Amino acid sequence: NANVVVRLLIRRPECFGPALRGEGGNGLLAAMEEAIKIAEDPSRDGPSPEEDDTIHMGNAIMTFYSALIDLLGRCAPEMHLIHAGKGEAIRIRSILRSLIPLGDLVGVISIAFQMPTIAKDGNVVEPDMSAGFCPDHKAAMVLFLDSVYGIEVQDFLLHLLEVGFLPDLRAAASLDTAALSATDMALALNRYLCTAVLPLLTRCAPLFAGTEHHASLIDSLLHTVYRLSKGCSLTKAQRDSIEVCLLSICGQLRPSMMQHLLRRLVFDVPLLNEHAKMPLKLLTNHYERCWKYYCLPGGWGNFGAASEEELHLSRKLFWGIFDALSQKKYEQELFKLALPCLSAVAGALPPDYMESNYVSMMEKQSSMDSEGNFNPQPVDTSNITIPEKLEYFINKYAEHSHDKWSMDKLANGWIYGEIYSDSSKVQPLMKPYKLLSEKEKEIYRWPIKESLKTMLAWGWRIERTREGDSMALYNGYSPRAIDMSNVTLSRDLHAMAEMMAENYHNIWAKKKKMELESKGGGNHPLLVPYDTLTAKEKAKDREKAQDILKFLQINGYAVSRGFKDLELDTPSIEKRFAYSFLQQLIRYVDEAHQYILE
Amino acid sequence: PGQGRNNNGLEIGCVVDAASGLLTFIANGKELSTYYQVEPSTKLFPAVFAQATSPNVFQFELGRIKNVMPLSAGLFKSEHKNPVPQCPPRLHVQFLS
Amino acid sequence: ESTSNSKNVPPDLSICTFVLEQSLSVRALQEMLANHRTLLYGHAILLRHSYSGMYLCCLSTSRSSTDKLAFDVGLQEDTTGEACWWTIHPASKQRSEGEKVRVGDDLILVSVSSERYLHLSYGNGSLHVDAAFQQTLWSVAPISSGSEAAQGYLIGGDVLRLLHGHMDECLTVPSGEHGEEQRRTVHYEGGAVSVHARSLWRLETLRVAWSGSHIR
Amino acid sequence: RDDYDFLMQTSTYYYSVRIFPGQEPANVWVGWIT
Amino acid sequence: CSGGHASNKEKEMVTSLFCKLGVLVRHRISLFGNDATSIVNCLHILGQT
């Protein structure tokens, strides 16, 4: 039947509509974009002389194209026939592949949605689907892409995640309030995801094995899927689909790529609520698979060992789950699932794991919270005071930033600012930084003040080297570029740069959240944790932090965290995880003995 | 003198007067204090000992300065009297291994 | 190549001539791929270019002449695969599948590899031949048959040398001088021009059909 | 400007090593070996 | 070679735990019900350790 229908359709190619018919017809992506524009335009969407008489021709076009693509995808041959190499099946697949380019499908999947929003008086503004772009239209694109083209290469899988799937997963995790989660777009996005996207990722899980260079994207995927799972208004089938996708991906991820996911689970698994079952199974599977990554000091070979941060997080998992289970009453399924988690974590943790006395100051537990999961709390810089010795670096970096700004303006093409020419848009005045008025010092100086005060508040030493900076301090516009692209930071420098970028994101998120609350709605995609952000969104904060650190390093001001361990704190009689575990085990056994005595 | 290395990267020029066996070094157009006096018939291989702190590390620039032959003239007998710098395929970068 | 303008511009049939190698049935061809005769409607034929020796096929790559759905028809060396085989079908209702294909009948050719018709496209300023979904009627005209009477007996399309005497001189044009203007002169020359290519001439009849027949 | 007679008759050879910006010169040694 | 050795106090605690589990299991398998297999298996593994 599929072969007959495909042959009839190709014999009569006018069945594909104005698009896809060739001879000047634009592509599927262009047709869908034009349909969206028509739906926006009242003149063509309606007649202009319950659905009732209204047709919403834009939605009609979208539905027609989605139905055609769905029919072709269902007419695509099956993988067993393809592997057998039967000529008719190969020919049909090639015909469909020629008819529909892959770029069209990827673009239609990348097309964004309209989101329900909150308006003043706290009411819900929900765009109508009968006159708009629906997730079903992309559920057909996914079906065709899987049936005809298929995803069997890691690069294409990751690209499609970052362009088409991850924005929608984030967009459905953002609609997790009581008012929005029960609306239409959330309810359709949940169906679309849990029936098309998540099963596709589950089937393509083995392609997630060697994604060590896309951590910023896989972390976003994991966090958004976990938030979707935590969300409400999900049916049992949707929850099961989320669970199987998350387990399948986490079972192929490298041990070091689930650090932030574990850091999020340490706050939810101890609660031992109904939601704490899929995390409780993720922990079991992860610590049964990657136990060598934690136990053996050598590691797992290619993957290495833990950084003591993952070890501390695992110890916190074990103790929190243990204490919470001790306090909790008996539930059959919860106690059937918790014990394997405890056993796996205990096996993963080395017995002689001594607790890290070096507890890093100001860990970002305040960046998130309970039931909010995102509280932007920047580090206070008002009470801290600037050092008197860093003014030279202030002036140098302000001048360098102004020079880069002037170079960007010259690339834009604006001419030298001899006079204030706003009519010709030569208004920035483009002068040497010395000649810039002292009133305009702040626009370049103040971000540097914020960055230095944040680094000071984090208890960091910006220490100046006598052997590197003494000769430096002794020693109409021609801007000079301090080309720091080749300047490379160290590993700890990268860690501090990432911390500062996260702080910048927290500042921006707090300001934008205050503005959003003032406006009474309009959620922004970027009001999500820095860990949940993707690399292309973290790029500008990361570049700012790296630029500041690179300028400090070039000028010679070495930035160091600069905390020393007061003492080694060996206590093999006190600090060992095995010692604490045995102490509590003996205590519990003695308590049980006393209870049985009475 | 500490600079930003923005007009150009560090350009250390090595000069060998083979008639006198004298080795001199130029930092940024000024002769450095360090110098060497090698024995007659000594064969000196141009070399760089570098620890990688950047993707791009350095360049063996086989050019010349005022009143000095390039390295290719010394290396190749056919180009002994040719002041034009050259990098024939025989000259390549070897590394200790 | 245009042929209606023969009186004004002679066509080049040496590159238009094709040979029908095999006429296996659809099922037999499918089985053989999985591993003389009169052409009948519905069979898959193999067409070999007489000059190049290659085979007519539906190339996977397409220059996309504003159609975005039609493949390009060209030549390939390998006869293996389903790209070089074309199923022949009747164009009108008076003929059906399995009937013996007549000389003057119009045929419809369908590529086995892609199920696209051998189609004539007007999209460009010139006219293009490409494997599209719109059917185009093709008329198969015979050039030569299986007779090939003897080794001599000049036939149309033959390449030969016009000997003047008893293998004494050959009709040719000046070539060694390397000049386009003076390569147009015609003269009898003796020597190694008898084995050089400078003295080769092709007989082209003034008729399209049966152009490879015996010369009278 | 270099004088041609001295240029041809000299036995002095030059090469240069450009350490790129962003690479610490303290970790780079330039010279000759046997 | 990779993992370190348990401390002397660690092994003391292991022996104490084994002894306490033995004292618990003495004459109370019926009161433990179907868990008596679990307690005796714990005693088994501790005795090896």
From Swiss-Prot, chain C:
<feature type="domain" description="MIR 1">
    <location>
        <begin position="36"/>
        <end position="91"/>
    </location>
</feature>
<comment type="subunit">
    <text>Homotetramer. Can also form heterotetramers with RYR1 and RYR3. Interacts with FKBP1A and FKBP1B; these interactions may stabilize the channel in its closed state and prevent Ca(2+) leaks. Interacts with CALM and S100A1; these interactions regulate channel activity. Identified in a complex composed of RYR2, FKBP1B, PKA catalytic subunit, PRKAR2A, AKAP6, and the protein phosphatases PP2A and PP1. Interacts directly with FKBP1B, PKA, PP1 and PP2A. Interacts with SELENON. In cardiac muscles, identified in a complex, composed of FSD2, CMYA5 and RYR2.</text>
</comment>
<feature type="domain" description="MIR 2">
    <location>
        <begin position="98"/>
        <end position="143"/>
    </location>
</feature>
<protein>
    <recommendedName>
        <fullName>Ryanodine receptor 2</fullName>
    </recommendedName>
</protein>
<comment type="function">
    <text>Cytosolic calcium-activated calcium channel that mediates the release of Ca(2+) from the sarcoplasmic reticulum into the cytosol and thereby plays a key role in triggering cardiac muscle contraction. Aberrant channel activation can lead to cardiac arrhythmia. In cardiac myocytes, calcium release is triggered by increased Ca(2+) cytosolic levels due to activation of the L-type calcium channel CACNA1C. The calcium channel activity is modulated by formation of heterotetramers with RYR3. Required for cellular calcium ion homeostasis. Required for embryonic heart development.</text>
</comment>
<feature type="domain" description="MIR 3">
    <location>
        <begin position="151"/>
        <end position="206"/>
    </location>
</feature>
<comment type="similarity">
    <text>Belongs to the ryanodine receptor (TC 1.A.3.1) family. RYR2 subfamily.</text>
</comment>
